[PDB]
C-alpha cells in the first residue's frame, strides 16, 4: 500500500462511491451556503473526478454544482478536527 | 489436402513503446485525443503502473488465443 | 424503377426459401431505403424510397418485423415534415 | 475485421502476403444482421432477465446449404 | 474585415500545427461573423475559413457541426458561392477523413439539388462538385446509392457537355 499510495493521484466517483455519481438535483443545500435571506443554493450534481492533493494528509478536491450554475470547490480533510476551525 | 507441416508460436514478444505521459513531438494530439490503450486509461493509474498494467493486459489478450506461449514484455 | 420494385418483390418473396442469403441483403437495402427517405430532399427520390419500403414490408414481413420500431419512427418523422 | 473497421477511417491495414480486399464481401452484411439480432435481446437479458434464445444464423446458413444441395448437382 | 482575417490566416499558417491552441478563441467569433456578414465579404470569409480548416485538420471537429449549419444556411444558386463552398468541402474532407461521413448527410440535399438543376456555363460547378465527390473517398459508402444516380444521369444525358460527362466518368472510375 505504501508503493500504491503515490499512484492515487485522482479518484473517480464510479469506483469510490457510485451513489454520489447517482446524486442529481438534490434539495440538500450546498455546505456553508445556506442563508435565511438569500435563496437556497441546492446541489445540482457532483463532479465525477476528485483531484487528490499530494500532501501528508492527502486532502481531496471536491467541487459541487449549485442550482444557480456556479461551481463551489471544497477540500475534503481527513483525520483532523474542524470544530476548532468552525469556532475560529 | 494433406498439411505439409504444423508450426507453433512457441514465444511471443510484446514491445510497447507507449511512452505514457509524454506525447511524441511528431503528432500534436487534440485535448480529448485517444486515451484508451488495450482498454486501459494510462493517465488514471500513473505512468509506470499504467505501462506495466497495459503490458499484463495485452499478454492476457494474446493468451486468450494462444495460452501456451512464453510471453516476454518490453516496456520502452 | 418498376423493374426495381419487381426485383425487390421477388427477393422479399424468396426471404423464406433462402433466408441466409436474402435477409442480410434485404437488411442492407432497408438501410439504404431508410437513409434515402430521411436525407434525400427530392420528391421523386422519396416517392421511390417509400414505394420500395412498402414493397419490402409486403414481401419481407419476417425481415422487417424486428425493425418495426425504427421503420415506424422514420415514417413518423417524415409524416410530420412541413408532393402527393 | 481489422481491414473492414479501419477502412472507414481512411486507414488500410497491410499484410506481407497481400490479401485481396474483403471489406465489401456480402458475408459482412450477415455479420451485421446476426449482431443486430443477437444484441437486440440485451435490454431484456440485463433488466428483465429473459432466457437467451440462440441466434438462427447457423440454422439459416445450413438451410441455404441445403437449398444449394437440392440443385447443386452440376460442378458450378 | 479582409485585413484582420488575412492576418489571422497568415499567423495560423506560420505557426503550423501549434495553432490548435487558439481554436476556442477564434472559431466562435469567426462563425458568428460569417453569420452576420453581408455582400462580397461572405465568399472571402468562406475561402479563409477553408484555409483555416486545412491548417487545423482533425481538430475542427467540435466546430464542424456549426460550420455545416452555416454552409447549409448560406448555400444558394449563386455560382461564386457554390464554387467557394465546394472548395471548402474539399478542404473539410481532406482535413477530417473518416469523421466526415457524420456530416455528409446534412450536405447531401444541396449536392442533389445542384446535380438536378445546374445552368452554369459548361456545368463547371458540377465538375468541381465531381472533384469533391472524388475526394470524399470511403465516407460515401453509406450514401453511394444517393450520390450515384445523379452522376449516372449526368454522364448518360446526351445534352450534357462533353467535359462534364467526361468528368462524371472519371469520378465514377476513381470511386471504383
Swiss-Prot record, chain A:
UniProt effect for mutating residue 49 to A: Reduced activity of the mTORC1 complex
Stretch list, region G-loop: 52-58
PTM comment: Autophosphorylates when part of mTORC1 or mTORC2. Phosphorylation in the kinase domain modulates the interactions of MTOR with RPTOR and AKT1S1/PRAS40 and leads to increased intrinsic mTORC1 kinase activity. Phosphorylation at Ser-49 by TBK1 in response to growth factors and pathogen recognition receptors promotes mTORC1 activity. Phosphorylation at Ser-49 by TBK1 in response to EGF growth factor promotes mTORC2 activity, leading to AKT1 phosphorylation and activation.
Protein function: Serine/threonine protein kinase which is a central regulator of cellular metabolism, growth and survival in response to hormones, growth factors, nutrients, energy and stress signals. MTOR directly or indirectly regulates the phosphorylation of at least 800 proteins. Functions as part of 2 structurally and functionally distinct signaling complexes mTORC1 and mTORC2 (mTOR complex 1 and 2).
Tissue: Expressed in numerous tissues, with highest levels in testis.
Domain commentary: The kinase domain (PI3K/PI4K) is intrinsically active but has a highly restricted catalytic center.
Subunit structure: Part of the mechanistic target of rapamycin complex 1 (mTORC1) which contains MTOR, MLST8 and RPTOR. The mTORC1 complex is a 1 Md obligate dimer of two stoichiometric heterotetramers with overall dimensions of 290 A x 210 A x 135 A. It has a rhomboid shape and a central cavity, the dimeric interfaces are formed by interlocking interactions between the two MTOR and the two RPTOR subunits.
Residues bearing the modification Phosphothreonine: 54, 63
UniProt similarity note: Belongs to the PI3/PI4-kinase family.
Disease: Smith-Kingsmore syndrome: An autosomal dominant syndrome characterized by intellectual disability, macrocephaly, seizures, umbilical hernia, and facial dysmorphic features.
Annotated positions binding ATP: 55, 57, 75, 77, 80
Cell location: Lysosome membrane; Endoplasmic reticulum membrane; Golgi apparatus membrane; Cell membrane
Designated name of the protein: Serine/threonine-protein kinase mTOR
Lineage start: Eukaryota, Metazoa, Chordata, Craniata, Vertebrata
Entry-annotated residues carrying Phosphoserine: 49
From Swiss-Prot, chain D:
Mod. after translation: O-GlcNAcylated by OGT upon glucose sufficiency, promoting interaction with small GTPases Rag (RagA/RRAGA, RagB/RRAGB, RagC/RRAGC and/or RagD/RRAGD) and subsequent recruitment of mTORC1 to lysosomal membranes, leading to activation of the mTORC1 complex.
Tissue expression remark: Highly expressed in skeletal muscle, and in a lesser extent in brain, lung, small intestine, kidney and placenta.
Subcellular localization: Lysosome membrane; Cytoplasm; Cytoplasmic granule
Subunit structure: Part of the mechanistic target of rapamycin complex 1 (mTORC1) which contains MTOR, MLST8 and RPTOR. mTORC1 associates with AKT1S1/PRAS40, which inhibits its activity. mTORC1 associates with DEPTOR, which regulates its activity. mTORC1 binds to and is inhibited by FKBP12-rapamycin. Forms a complex with MTOR under both leucine-rich and -poor conditions. Interacts with (via TOS motifs) EIF4EBP1 and RPS6KB1; interaction is independent of its association with MTOR. (Microbial infection) Interacts with vaccinia virus protein F17; this interaction dysregulates mTOR.
Protein family membership: Belongs to the WD repeat RAPTOR family.
Function, in words: Component of the mechanistic target of rapamycin complex 1 (mTORC1), an evolutionarily conserved central nutrient sensor that stimulates anabolic reactions and macromolecule biosynthesis to promote cellular biomass generation and growth. In response to nutrients, growth factors or amino acids, mTORC1 is recruited to the lysosome membrane and promotes protein, lipid and nucleotide synthesis by phosphorylating several substrates, such as ribosomal protein S6 kinase (RPS6KB1 and RPS6KB2) and EIF4EBP1 (4E-BP1).
Protein's recorded name: Regulatory-associated protein of mTOR
Organism: Homo sapiens
Gene it is expressed from: RPTOR
Amino acid at each position: 500500500i505504501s508503493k500504491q499510495l503515490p499512484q492515487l493521484t485522482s479518484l473517480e466517483l464510479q469506483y469510490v462511491s457510485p451513489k454520489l455519481l447517482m446524486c442529481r438535483d438534490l434539495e440538500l443545500a450546498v455546505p456553508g451556503t445556506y442563508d435565511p435571506n438569500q435563496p437556497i443554493i441546492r446541489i445540482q450534481s457532483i463532479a465525477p473526478s476528485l483531484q487528490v492533493i499530494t500532501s501528508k494528509q492527502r486532502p481531496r478536491k471536491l467541487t459541487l454544482m449549485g442550482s444557480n450554475g456556479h461551481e463551489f470547490v471544497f477540500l475534503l480533510k481527513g483525520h483532523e478536527d474542524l470544530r476548532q476551525d468552525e469556532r475560529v | 489436402w494433406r498439411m505439409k507441416d504444423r508450426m507453433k508460436t512457441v514465444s511471443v514478444a510484446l514491445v510497447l513503446c507507449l511512452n505514457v505521459g509524454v506525447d511524441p513531438p511528431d503528432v500534436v494530439k487534440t485535448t480529448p485525443c485517444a486515451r484508451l490503450e488495450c482498454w486501459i486509461d494510462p493517465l488514471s493509474m500513473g505512468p509506470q503502473k499504467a505501462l506495466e498494467t497495459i503490458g499484463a493486459n495485452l499478454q492476457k489478450q494474446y493468451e486468450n488465443w494462444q495460452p501456451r506461449a512464453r510471453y516476454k514484455q518490453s516496456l520502452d | 424503377f418498376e423493374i426495381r420494385e419487381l426485383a425487390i418483390c421477388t427477393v422479399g418473396r424468396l426471404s423464406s426459401m433462402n433466408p441466409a442469403f436474402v435477409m442480410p441483403f434485404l437488411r442492407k437495402m432497408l438501410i439504404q431505403i431508410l437513409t434515402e427517405l430521411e436525407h434525400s430532399g427530392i420528391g421523386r427520390i422519396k416517392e421511390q424510397s417509400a414505394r420500395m419500403l412498402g414493397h419490402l414490408v409486403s414481401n419481407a414481413p419476417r425481415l422487417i418485423r424486428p425493425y418495426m420500431e425504427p421503420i415506424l419512427k422514420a415514417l413518423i418523422l417524415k409524416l410530420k415534415d412541413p408532393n402527393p | 475485421l481489422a481491414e473492414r473497421i479501419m477502412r472507414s477511417y481512411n486507414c488500410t491495414p497491410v499484410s506481407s502476403p497481400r490479401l485481396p480486399p474483403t471489406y465489401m464481401h456480402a458475408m459482412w452484411q450477415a455479420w451485421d444482421l446476426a449482431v443486430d439480432i443477437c444484441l437486440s435481446q440485451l435490454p431484456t437479458i440485463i433488466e428483465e432477465g429473459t432466457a437467451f434464445r440462440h441466434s438462427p444464423f447457423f440454422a439459416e446458413q445450413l438451410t441455404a446449404f441445403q437449398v444449394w444441395l437440392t440443385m447443386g448437382v452440376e460442378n458450378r | 474585415h479582409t485585413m484582420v482575417v488575412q492576418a489571422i490566416t497568415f499567423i495560423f499558417k506560420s505557426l503550423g500545427l501549434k495553432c490548435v491552441q487558439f481554436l476556442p478563441q477564434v472559431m466562435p467569433t469567426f462563425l458568428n461573423v460569417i453569420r452576420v456578414c453581408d455582400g462580397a465579404i461572405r465568399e472571402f470569409l468562406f475561402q479563409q475559413l477553408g484555409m483555416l480548416v486545412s491548417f487545423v485538420k482533425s481538430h475542427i471537429r467540435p466546430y464542424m457541426d456549426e460550420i455545416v449549419t452555416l454552409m447549409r444556411e448560406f448555400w444558394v444558386m449563386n455560382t461564386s458561392i457554390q464554387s467557394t463552398i465546394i472548395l471548402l468541402i474539399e478542404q473539410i474532407v481532406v482535413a477530417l477523413g473518416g469523421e466526415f461521413k457524420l456530416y455528409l448527410p446534412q450536405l447531401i440535399p444541396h449536392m442533389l439539388r445542384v446535380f438536378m438543376h445546374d445552368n452554369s456555363p459548361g456545368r463547371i460547378v458540377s465538375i468541381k462538385l465531381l472533384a469533391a465527390i472524388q475526394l470524399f473517398g470511403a465516407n460515401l459508402d453509406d450514401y453511394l446509392h444517393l450520390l450515384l444516380p445523379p452522376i449516372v444521369k449526368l454522364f448518360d444525358a446526351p445534352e450534357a457537355p462533353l467535359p462534364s460527362r467526361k468528368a462524371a466518368l472519371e469520378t465514377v472510375d476513381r470511386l471504383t
